[PDB]
């Protein structure tokens, strides 16, 4: 089988600049006077979207900011100028022979200015408490870069092992990320304590931001 290797695995590029992604093949994907190479863009919850076909041809409905070049074993996707909506994964693929195979993908991050998260804390609903479990939710909204630290405090006691977090993909408009952290406790443990705090560290913040509530 032909192995497609993409480089780099991830890159961060400023608006207006050029993004360059390479696809190298373990043997030639060029035959009968054509290069059977394709480039796709993919965002979460969506199928791959074909950008470039047969190495250098622009797909209908795709901006001419996207271009492809190369032949044989070496191929390049260029994006210029880079726009906010280009935040996505990019994949190469060949159709030179059976089986068709794909590159491992490249994540394009759009560089933007540092932005601090807006932090929000949510107590468990009364409806949920009926079920015997309490979920406490902390939201970090619209921040950049992605690196962030969330710490849970219950009656000033640092929590460990009882939280889960997830982070959105980069926003297609404002180039930010958002993050949700959930602290899970039994109703019994929740009712035993008073102060529930989410402490956020991010480079956009001069010092940690703590959002908290008192149960009651």
């Amino acid at each position: 089988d032909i192995v497609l290797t993409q480089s780099p695995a991830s890159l961060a590029i400023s608006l207006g600049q050029r993004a360059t992604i390479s696809c190298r093949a373990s043997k030639s994907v060029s035959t009968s006077g054509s290069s059977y190479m394709f480039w796709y863009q993919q965002k979460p919850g969506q199928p791959p979207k074909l950008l470039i076909y047969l190495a250098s041809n622009l797909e209908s409905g795709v901006p001419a900011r996207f271009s492809g070049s190369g032949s044989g074993t070496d191929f390049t996707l260029n994006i210029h100028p880079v726009e906010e909506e280009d935040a996505a994964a990019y994949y190469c693929q060949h159709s030179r022979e059976i089986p068709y195979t794909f590159g491992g993908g490249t994540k394009l991050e759009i560089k933007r200015t540092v932005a601090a998260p807006s932090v929000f804390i949510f107590p468990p609903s009364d409806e949920q408490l009926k079920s015997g479990t309490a979920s406490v939710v902390c939201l970090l909204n619209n921040f950049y870069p992605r690196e962030a630290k969330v710490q849970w405090k219950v009656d000033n006691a640092l929590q460990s092992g009882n939280s889960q977090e997830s982070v959105t993909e980069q926003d297609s408009k404002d180039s930010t990320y958002s993050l949700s952290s959930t602290l899970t406790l039994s109703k019994a443990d929740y009712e035993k304590h008073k102060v529930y705090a989410c402490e956020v560290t991010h480079q956009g913040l001069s010092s940690p931001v703590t959002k908290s509530f008192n149960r009651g």
């Binding site: 089988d1 394709f38 979460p44 969506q46 199928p47 791959p48 979207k49 074909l50 076909y53 047969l54 041809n57 797909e59 994964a89 994949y91 693929q93 159709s95 059976i98 089986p99 068709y100 195979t101 794909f102 491992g104 993908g105 807006s118 929000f120 949510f122 107590p123 468990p124 609903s125 409806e127 949920q128 079920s131 979920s135 939710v137 939201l139 909204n141 619209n142 889960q164 977090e165 997830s166 982070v167 959105t168 958002s178 993050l179 949700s180 959930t182 899970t184 509530f213």
Partner: protein, 212 residues
């Protein structure tokens, strides 16, 4: 004009068979093209599985040849995937796509498929009450398998919405949150409802999110 749409069970047990359908509209599957199945694993790797051509000839990925079948129903303008003896390594999002010898132009929306012995479970939906800018949301908790969809105010509210990737809890059930930020002044005038759909369990929940 040309559209492809996958359909399938969403959940199958280890060792049993997976069967998927791609419905093609706006183009006859006997006219032209090769009609492909492509899957994407949880860590995002893409794998081409096989195709059936307009003439009925098939080509398969050698890694799957012993358990893959690709068939068609020309009267319904549909083609099919069968994958036998599935394992947890067959958990993926499955896509159908066209190929004409130049380009892979048309793709389905994808169908999520989980291989697990666990039963389907519908989510509980809890409000994340709002207490400048205010945030509110819904916690969609304790469902299986993926996916859920969430919209706000029946699709009328889209700005500032963030729906987070689900996490698998220690119970083996998924949990996710969806949030939106809105003007604080709107909390007394605008109603807020999250619309949750979990197709595997036929769960449709509209949950009002009221200031507390």
């Amino acid at each position: 004009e040309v559209q492809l749409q996958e359909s399938g069970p969403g959940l199958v047990k280890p060792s049993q068979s997976l069967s998927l359908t791609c419905t093609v509209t706006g183009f006859s599957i006997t006219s032209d093209y090769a009609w492909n199945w492509i899957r994407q694993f949880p860590g995002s790797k893409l794998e081409w599985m096989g195709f059936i051509s307009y003439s009925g000839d098939t080509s398969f990925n050698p890694s799957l040849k012993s358990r893959i079948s690709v068939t068609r129903d020309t009267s319904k303008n549909q083609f099919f995937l069968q994958l036998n003896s599935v394992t947890t390594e067959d958990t993926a999002t499955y896509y159908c796509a066209s190929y004409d010898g130049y380009s892979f132009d048309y793709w389905g929306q994808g169908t999520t498929l989980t291989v697990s012995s666990a039963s389907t479970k519908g989510p509980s939906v809890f409000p994340l009450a709002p207490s400048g800018t205010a945030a509110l949301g819904c916690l969609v908790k304790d469902y299986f398998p993926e996916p859920v969809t969430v919209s706000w105010n029946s699709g009328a509210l889209t700005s500032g919405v963030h729906t987070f990737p689900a996490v698998l809890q220690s119970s083996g059930l998924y949990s996710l949150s969806s949030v939106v930020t809105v003007p604080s002044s709107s909390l007394g005038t605008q109603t807020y409802i999250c619309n949750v759909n979990h197709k595997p369990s036929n769960t449709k929940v509209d949950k009002k999110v009221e200031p507390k």
